Symmetry: D2
Subunit: 232 residues, 4 copies
C-alpha cells in the first residue's frame, strides 16, 4: 500500500498547499475543487481530481468512489474552505447563517461521513480540517467563520471520542493571517511575529498531523498564528 | 422605573423558572412558548404572553411589539431552548439544530436591541449547556451550536459594549427539569442535580446592576461536572 | 443561622469592598489586613480584625480562632491579594518567582486549609478568591500575578472536586481594570465597555457567589472585565 | 560545513520522554547536549555523538556549565527541550507550603532557568525554539498530580508572556502536554480511560517535539498541544 489522501477545496490556497505537501510526503492524492485548478493540480501531482462542490453530497461520493476504485483505501482527509458571509453581527440574515453553516461546518462533516467506512475497515485514519485562529477569540471581521468553526471544534471532539477506539483521529488546524491572500501592514504588525504565516507552514502542520508520529493526537485545535491570539 | 423582561421558551423548565424568579425580583414579564404554557404562566405572574414559535420572526415581533406597547421598554431578554450518532445526523438535522439552539437566541436579540440602544441599557442572557466546550454524544446538536453561540455572544458583546448592552450565557449541567439516573447523578462531584431555581438565581444575578461589568461570558452551573478550569 | 465571613487582605480595594458588601448582606465579618484599615473597617461593621500578614501562619490561625470563638462557624472565606513582582519575563529572579507564589497562590491556599475543618463540620462552605482577568490571557504587565493565578485555577478545580461531596465550594472572580486604581486613557479605551469596573461590582459578584442561589457553582473562574479579554 | 549544524539542548534528558526527544532530535540531524542527574545522560549523549553533563536541572551552576560547553563546542543553541522529574503528590490541602515551593522548582523553574541561559544565543541568531514537556492535566487537573497541574498551568502563562516578548526576534516557545505515556509502568484502569484504548509512546511525544523543532512549525508560538489519545474533555 501507498497511502491515500483526499483534499476537499484543494484547488487553491491552503487546500492546494496541503495537497502539494502530502504528495511530496508520498501520499497518492485525490482533489475536489469547484474550480478547474483542482484537476490541473491533481494531474500535476500524479493523482486524481473531481470538479464539483464541497457542498454537494453527490460530487463528494464521486470523489470517494473514484479514490476507492483506484487505490482501495483512504488514509487522510483534509478539508479546506471557501469564504462565507461577513457583515455586522445582527445584520447577518437567517439565510446567511444557514449558508455559513454549509460553508464552514458541513464542508467538513459531509466528506467525513463518506470516508469513515474505509477508515473503519482499515482501523486507521486521519481527518484534518482547516479552521480559523479566531474560532474561540472571534472578531467582527469573520463572524460566520468563527461561529461555525467553534461548532466544528465540538463536532470534532464528539467525533474523536466516537471513533478513537477504531484508531481514527480528527484534528483542526487554526490559521492566523496566512499569505494565501494579500497582506496589509496593520494586520502584519498586529502579529507578535510581525509576518504573515506561509501557506507552506499550514501545509507542514497538516503533514505532521497526517504522519504516524502524530497518531496519539486527536480532538485538538492547534493554532498556527504567529502568536496573534491571546489565550493560552 | 418598572423594568421589563422578555423570556423565550418560558413555558417550562429553565425558562419558566427564570420567568418566575424575574417576576419575584420585580420585573414585568412577557413570555413566549409554542405549547401555550407560557401564556398561562404569564397570566399567573401578572405579565403578558404569546403562543407561537421562537423560530418565527412574526410571532417574535408580536411579543416584542406587545411588550413595548404595554411597558415602553425591554431591559432583559432570556432565551431558553427546546440524541443520534455523530455521523448519522443528516444535513437537514444539522440545519434544524442550528435553528433550535443558535437562531433561537439570535432572532429575538435582533428585535430587542433597538429598545436597548434607546435606553442605553440592556442584558441578554442565553441558556446554553455545560457540554458546549466538553461535548458528548448525548447532546450533539445542542453542544455544537451552543459552542457556536458562545462565539456569537463574544462578537455581540464587543459590538454593543459601548452602548451598555451586555450578553452572557448560563451553562447548566444536570438539572432537575428532567428525572435523574444514578450514573448521571454520581458523575457530578456535588452528587446531586442542580435545581431549576439555581439556574434561575444565576439568571437573576446576571439581570441585576451588580453584574453590569460582566459581558461575553459563559458561566457553568454544573456542580463541578465539567473538567476544565 | 447567623452566617460568618472571613476576608483576607480586606483593608482596602476589592477586599474591603467585599467585606462591606457581605456585612450589608447580613454576614458577621472578620478581617485580616497588614494595614490598620482592616481593623477600623471590622470595628465599624461590628466584627473583628487582625492586623497582620496573609503570609503568616500565626496571624491567619489567630484570625480563624478568634472568628470561631466569637460566632462558632465560618461560612465564607474571601481571599483578596496584595501586589507581587512585575519585571521583564526573564529578569524575574527565582526568588521573585517564589515571592510571587506566596503573594498570589499561597495567600489563598493557606487560609483555605484552616477554614475547611469548620466547613466540613457544617457540611457547607464557600471560598472565593480574587484572581485576575489576565490569568489565561496574560500580559507582560503582571507576570507573577498571571502565572500564579493560572496555578490558582488548577488548585481551585482539584479543591472543588475533592470537597464537592461535602457541599464546600470554591470559585474565583477574575477582575479586569477596576477603579481601585486610577485609570489611564489607553487602558480605559481598551475595555469594550469603555470604563473601569467598580469595586462594588466585584463585591456584588462575590455576594452572589456567597449566596444560596449560587450553590451549584463550583470550580469556576468568572471574568468580570467589561469585555476586555478575547476568549469565549 | 555548507549547511548549519543545528544544536539542541535537552534538560532531564537521561530517561523517559527527555531521552526519547534527545534520540529523535539526533536522528533529525541535531547535535545534542544532555543534562541528567544520572550517568544515563552522558552515556546517551556519547551514543548520539553529542555532549552531556551530569547534574541537576534545579541548579543554575550545572545548567550554566552545559550551556557554556555547548556554545564552546558548536557556537549556537537552536533548540531547548525541558523535561521534568516528579513532584509532590498528596491530598490537596495536605501539600505543605514547602511541597508547593518544591513543586514550583520541579515543574516551573525547570523550564524558566535554562530559558534564561539560552535566549542570548537565540537573540544573536535571530532564531530559536524552546519546548517544554508539560501535562495534559494542566487545565483539567486531577487530584492524582496536584503540583504538576498547578505549575504547568503556571508554565502556560509564562510561555505566553515569553512568546509575546520574543516573537519579533523569531524565538518561539511551546508546550507539549502528554497524557498517559509508556515512559512509566502502565495500569489497565488508566489504559481503558483513554478513548484510543492505549498509552502513548515516548516516541510519539518525541515526534511532536521534532515537529515543533522543525522549520515547518515556525509560525506556532505560545501554544499548549495535548497529546493524549483523546483523554482530556475540552475542545
Amino acid at each position: 500500500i501507498q497511502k491515500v489522501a483526499i483534499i476537499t477545496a484543494g484547488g487553491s490556497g491552503m487546500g492546494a498547499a496541503s495537497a502539494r505537501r502530502l504528495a511530496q510526503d508520498g501520499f497518492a492524492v485525490a482533489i475536489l475543487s469547484s474550480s478547474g485548478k483542482g484537476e490541473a493540480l491533481a494531474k500535476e501531482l500524479g493523482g486524481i481530481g473531481v470538479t464539483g462542490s464541497n457542498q454537494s453530497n453527490d460530487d463528494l461520493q464521486k470523489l470517494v468512489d473514484q479514490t476507492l476504485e483506484k487505490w482501495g483505501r483512504i488514509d487522510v482527509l483534509v478539508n479546506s474552505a471557501g469564504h462565507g458571509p461577513r457583515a455586522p453581527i445582527l445584520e447577518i440574515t437567517d439565510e446567511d447563517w444557514h449558508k455559513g453553516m454549509d460553508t464552514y461546518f458541513l464542508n467538513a462533516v459531509r466528506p467525513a461521513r463518506l470516508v469513515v467506512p474505509a477508515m473503519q475497515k482499515q482501523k486507521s485514519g486521519v481527518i484534518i480540517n482547516i479552521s480559523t485562529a479566531w474560532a474561540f477569540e472571534p472578531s467582527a471581521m469573520f463572524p460566520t467563520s468563527a461561529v461555525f468553526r467553534a461548532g466544528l471544534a465540538s463536532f470534532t471532539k464528539i467525533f474523536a471520542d466516537t471513533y478513537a477506539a477504531e484508531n481514527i483521529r480528527m484534528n483542526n488546524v487554526l490559521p492566523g493571517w496566512i499569505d494565501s491572500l494579500p497582506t496589509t501592514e496593520e494586520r502584519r504588525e498586529s502579529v507578535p511575529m510581525q509576518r504573515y504565516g506561509k501557506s507552506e507552514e499550514i501545509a507542514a502542520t497538516v503533514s505532521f498531523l497526517a504522519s504516524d508520529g502524530a497518531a496519539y493526537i486527536t480532538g485538538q485545535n492547534l493554532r498556527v498564528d504567529g502568536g496573534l491570539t491571546r489565550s493560552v
